Structures are given as structure tokens and as C-alpha cells.
Amino acid sequence: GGGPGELGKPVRLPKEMSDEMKKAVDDGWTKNAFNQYVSDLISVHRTLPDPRDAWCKDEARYLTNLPKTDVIICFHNEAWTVLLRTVHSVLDRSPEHLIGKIILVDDYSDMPHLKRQLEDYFAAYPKVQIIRGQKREGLIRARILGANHAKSPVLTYLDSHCECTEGWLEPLLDRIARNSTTVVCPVIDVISDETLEYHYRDSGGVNVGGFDWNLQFSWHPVPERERKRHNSTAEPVYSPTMAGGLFSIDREFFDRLGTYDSGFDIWGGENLELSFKTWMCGGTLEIVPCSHVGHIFRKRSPYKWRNVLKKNSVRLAEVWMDEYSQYYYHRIGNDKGDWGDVSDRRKLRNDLKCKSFKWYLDNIYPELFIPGDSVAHGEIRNLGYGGRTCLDAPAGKKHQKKAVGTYPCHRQGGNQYWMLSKAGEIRRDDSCLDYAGKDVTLFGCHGGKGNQFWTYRENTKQLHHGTSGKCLAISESKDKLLMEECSASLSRQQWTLENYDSSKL
Ligand SMILES: O=c1ccn([C@@H]2O[C@H](COP(=O)(O)OP(=O)(O)O)[C@@H](O)[C@H]2O)c(=O)[nH]1
Ligand SMILES: *[C@@H]1O[C@H](CO)[C@@H](O)[C@H](O)[C@H]1NC(C)=O
Ligand SMILES: [Mn+2]
């Protein structure tokens, strides 16, 4: 008898339900930003399907002597059944002799079930130790507390809403056992927040980590330069950056790299910091397609707030990004703010004798588009009806299927930051302007030109669409961004593009 959710199948609550049941379902969504009521019906030892490729069972060989790892799971107000299932998943699917301590770091959670109730439950489980923080300090400082209580040669981090799968630990530990400067992440699969269903995929469609120039992590598929390094797609692949929070690193190597920046605030790109340090200071970062961990992805985080990631992102750039720091500052309007004292980190970098950031981009992440190489980058200004209207929209996968609009120019960047590429893209990060006969849209650059292809006609100042033959323009209300027949005499069809350089063409 496996129960609800056995083998990763979804769980759906009745269509019509009593009121007390409704209150509890909503109670669960309010507290956790997933459906706790569903999670509570699912076994804490919920069985899962084997997501590993044929290659991972048959043709992959791992060294016989692997380093003992500690597992650090930070949490704050995590749900009972969810936290337990993460811990029970490590114990049940990891070879006993490879787990030293399962360290649960508390970070000043206040819900009763994580206090004494957790202590009594894991009393029977000797490898589980509970460290309690004295005040809410956030993820970054908590992982550092866990690394201080850990004595095993290797650290492995997991969120409190994860599920390890069959064979998850050996392929990660194998990479470190070959070479200790190697940081590794499992493939991070999706557990539905609504049904807790488990979703895994072919090692063909594996994504490797990069970043947008707002210093946010972002996924991209494995570059061909990398795929050509491998006889099979299930071998470990280089990844210029980690998503963060699920990874394994050598404990002393973690220490040597300065762990996380002590001066970061909660809103941190510590994941980006650790990634750059690993590459630039004698290590490598790998995604191991043979290792799958499920994670409960949430649409929002229900945490107290204490723009705002700006401090952590500027320290990351002031220390680690050399001349390329300027490209982050453009996106935030050069309002760098006050990132605090950062001297300790500059000394740390010099003592380790790390490579330059250009080296990182040139050798590890050369696929990344550098805004300085574009024909123009900055705001896109329309000269019509006052000349104080700018191309303005948000990017991302939620703001796909939105029409791109217009808004008054604030020289602050962000939503009015764009690059005109040599390949005729008007873009922000991996998003491209696109026109297929209804509205102008921002979605994902496919690199095929066509409807994502534009021409800036220097003498006329028009933005010309190759396939529709139309010209880009703004309406009289200045609220909408439309396509119309090209007329040289129309001011609503004129644009000036910041940093236009003819020679980048
Ligand atoms: O102040 C906090 C809030 C979050 N968490 C924990 O940090 C882990 C990762 O956080 P989260 O899942 O919210 O980040 P995400 O994966 O959504 O980016 C989770 O186990 C949380 O319980 C924490 O340690 N301190
Ligand atoms: C070990 O770690 C990485 C993997 O290639 C690399 O930086 C380093 O040169 C490797 N070699 C040695 C001798 O440690
Ligand atoms: Mn998470």
C-alpha cells in the first residue's frame, strides 16, 4: 500500500469540499505558497520513479571510495510533512556510509511543529542534528552556520522542500572524489506546488546556468561547444553558474573560497558570487545529469522583507566583475547606492590569485551576449509628440504574451534598457522584440531573424521590421506601441538609440 502520491503521481482534492476543509487548504497556501493539505496526505516516505537515463545505470562507472558528505538543509517555518520528506529522502536513497550528518539549520522559525516536536521525532535518528539560530538571519548566514557545525570532508546543501531520487548521491560525490576543486549540482526537477506531482525529463533537454545583466540567475540550454565535449548527454556538463541552494562542494574548498560574502543581505546573489569564485579561483562547476533532486517550485516566497537586491548585486560586481561591472550599473540607472564595506572580499580575491573576469567570460561563458558589443544599448527614445516617450516593457516568461508599450523616459534603465544587436535584435537579456501582425511582444530570442529582425535606418531614424515591411511608431495617446506604413516625414516614427555606434554593424 503506497498511498496518495505514490510514484510521484499527482494529488487532486475533491471538487466540492466542506468549509473547514477549504479553510485548511487555503491555510496551507497562505503559510507555504504550495498546497500543504495535499502534501500532508502524501507519505513522508513517498516513493518516486527512477528518473535516471539508461546511460547512468549501465555505462557510467563511479569510483569505489567516495567522500563522506554532510547534508545541510536550512529552513524557516517549513511545513512538517515537507521538511520531513526532504530529510527522509536523504536517509532512504543515500548509501549509509556516505552520510555523516544531516544538519537542519533553524533560522528562528516560530511555528510550534519545528521546535520540540521536531526534536522528539528525530530523536530516534542519530545522524540528524538540529542547530538553532538566535535571530532570523536569512539563508546566506544560515548555510554558513551549518558549514561551521559540519565535520565531514564534503558539504551538500538542499532546500527544505526537496526530494532526492534513486542514485542521487553517488554521481555528485564521484566528481569531488576525482578532483576536490569541483563543485557539482544535481539536475533540479519540478514538484508541482499544486499536486506535488514529480516531473523529470530526458538528459537531452538539460539546462545549464548563466545570468542576466541585472545579476539574476537564468537558465540556458547546453551550448554546442559543450555538447561536443561529450560522447553522451548524460555525462557531467560545465555550467558557468549554479541556480544555488542545491549543490555539493568540498568543505575546506568552500572555506578557502570565502564561503558566502558576510556583508550580503538576505536578498542575495550569493549563488552568483559562489559561481564566479569557483571558476576564477581554481575550480570548476558541473551539472551532473545522472543526479536528480526534486524541488517544490513556488510562484512567490512568503518571507518577511526585513531596488533591494541592489546591495548584494553591487558588491558582487564591485569585487568580482572587473570592467564588466559597468553593464550591471547601466541596468539599474547607475544608482549604485551604498553597498557597505567590501574591503575584506577584495583582499580575499587577491590572496587566492584568481583569474580576471574577462577570462571567465572568454573561456567559461563565451556564449553570453555582452551589451557593449551591441550596435546600441540603453534607452530607445521616440521623437514624436514631445519626444519624452520611451520604449518600455518588462522581460521574462510571465510578461510574454504582453504587448510592449510606451512610458515617459526616466533615465534609470531597467524597463527602458534595450540593446540593438548586430543580428537585428532589439533585446534585453534572452528576450527579443517580435511582431507577427497583432501586437509587438517581448519573448525569447530564437536567433532566427525573421519576425525578431529589425533595422535602424540612420538617416531617417526609423526602426524597420524586415518581414512585415512596416515601421515602429507610437500613437497620439503615447500609451500604445504600434506598427504602420513607413513614412519618412512622420515624427512618430523616429527613434534615437542610446550609444549608437555604426562600426559595431
Ligand atoms: O529566512 C529564510 C527563509 C528561507 N530559508 C530556507 O531557504 C531554503 C531556500 O529558500 P527558498 O526555497 O524560499 O528559495 P527558492 O528556491 O524559492 O529560490 C528553504 O529551505 C527555506 O526554508 C531560510 O533558510 N531562511
Ligand atoms: C583538478 O580540478 C579542475 C578539473 O580539471 C582543474 O581546475 C584542475 O587543473 C584539475 N587538475 C589538477 C591537477 O588538480
Ligand atoms: Mn526552494
Author numbering: 143 to 448, 452 to 650
Sentences from the paper on this structure:
CG30463 is predicted to encode a ppGalNAcT/PGANT, which is an O-glycosyltransferase responsible for the post-translational addition of the sugar N-acetylgalactosamine (GalNAc) to proteins, a modification typically found on mucins and other secreted and membrane-bound proteins. ppGalNAcTs are type II membrane proteins that belong to the CAZy family GT2731. Interestingly, we found two distinct Drosophila cDNA clones emanating from the CG30463 gene, differing only in a ~30 amino acid region (the α subunit) of the lectin domain. Comparison of these clones to genomic sequence data revealed that they represent splice variants of exon 8. This splicing event generates an α subunit with a net positive charge (isoform A, containing exon 8A) or a net negative charge (isoform B, containing exon 8B).
However, there is insufficient electron density to model in a peptide, and the partially ordered active site loop containing residues Arg 440 to Arg 448 is in a semi-closed conformation. The distribution of positively charged residues in the α subunit of PGANT9A creates a predominantly positively charged patch that extends the entire length of the lectin domain, and the proximity of the positively charged loop to the active site suggests that it dictates preferences for substrates that contain negatively charged residues, as the positively charged surface could form non-specific electrostatic interactions with the substrate to position it for catalysis.
